[PDB]
Amino acid sequence: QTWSGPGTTKRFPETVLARCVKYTEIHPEMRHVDCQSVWDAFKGAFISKHPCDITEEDYQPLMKLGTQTVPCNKILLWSRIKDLAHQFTQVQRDMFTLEDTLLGYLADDLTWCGEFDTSKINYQSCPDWRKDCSNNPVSVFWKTVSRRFAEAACDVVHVMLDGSRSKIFDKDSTFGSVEVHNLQPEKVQTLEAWVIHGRDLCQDPTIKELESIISKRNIQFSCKNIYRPDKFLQCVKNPEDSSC
Template sequence: MPLVEGVSLKLSLERWLIRHCGSWKAEGTPSFPGGGHCVDVGTRVGSQPSHCPGSSRGESTKLIKESWRGASGCRNQDCKKILNAFTSAFVSKDPCSITKEDYQPLINLVTQTVPCNKTLFWSRSKELAHQYSGIQNEMFTLEDTLLGYIADDLVWCGDPRTSEVKEEFCPYRNENCSSTATSVFWTVVSQKFAESACGTVYVMLNGSGTTAFSKASTFGSVEVFNLHPDRVHTLHAWVMHDIGGVSRDSCLGSSIKELKSIVNQRNISFLCQDDYRPARFVQCVRRPEDPACSTLM
């Protein structure tokens, strides 16, 4: 069974709990809005007061450990409930037999709400989508919300022989191990993220790959099918192409036509735009000398 090494999940969890589960108090005890639940109502994860240790996604292990030490002062019971609901989904269980129901207590405990017209999905364009949402603070990817921020780039699993959380040597998802703790988690939170979307929603796709839209992706297999037509009236696709790279697919391509058909069948309007200009500016920050960028000026 192929194995993957993880990074410090527990430290990341505690970092998140102390920073983002309500407002920060000087003594290190978060307070919780919403009457006992951890509620994220359009608040960007990763934007915390200056006296919180660390500052952004992707910080060093040293800063994560500092946050872990700070989190020891968290005495609100809901912090423990959230952590326990997460770990209980997979601890002491077969790492290849996790179910969506295992994560349901966590989903029920944490309420995620993104304002209408501000949801940004992505497929094979994670880096650019995050760069764009980081600049356009009104837009939210899944990783800008509470549960997405916890687990971004992390790997974890359980083992029937121990009650410990394993962060190293967890199995890859494959045909013999299709329900790993990590893959099922992302399926569940992606479904919830899509179900809560409203108004016009956006998806950033990669037109430099073989196909911009794939039904095998999380967006193509989970998110697009969990948009509620009574809440979402339009899906706006941005097909982005690498600066100086090859353009293999576009809004006129067959994969986008397939996406449009799926969306229209769900009674949701569809719009598509190649190389959305504001996102193109973000790409050009790193390649301002490229001819494709000079035409934007």
């Protein structure tokens, strides 16, 4: 095998297309997206390209077709706690993660790459970010869309963090390396962290580091513990409870 990472997800083309159809069927704003054109732009970003030479520019046509206004004050970022974040926005349809946007939805949990100077999709292997190269089709996609998603944020932006991790805030994560640095100080008043337990984890040294970084960008920092994730989701679903 050429690469260290898993290959393209089985029936990736069909999957992307069907996810686009489903998304544009559900969301009114996207009711006039051409899903064939979306797929054309998507594969055009990586097909026939060396999968270690992908650029942010390669994804521009896809970004254009997938342009979407998201309510800027309703953004939930997350790091290393994907499941709860998505369960949260499933209940509180008010709030959006990146994976609730058209492009994030299309790509979530999928792997893809092409081969240099041929039209084939590589279903055998693809570059691993760490072992092979960082400018691969998947990593460059997420870097670009997550930057744009962070730039769209305003007002109070929330981030869900995993408090069972050794690094609750990890500066090397997508959240720490891309999103925190692309929030716009002109628009974003506060970054509020929700530290999810499995103790005042808002006093953890990495949260303090996050606090310092954000403050120095002239954005306010707030932090809250979520001691009981189950009860959290319970109250998100049934919030009028006295118990909430």
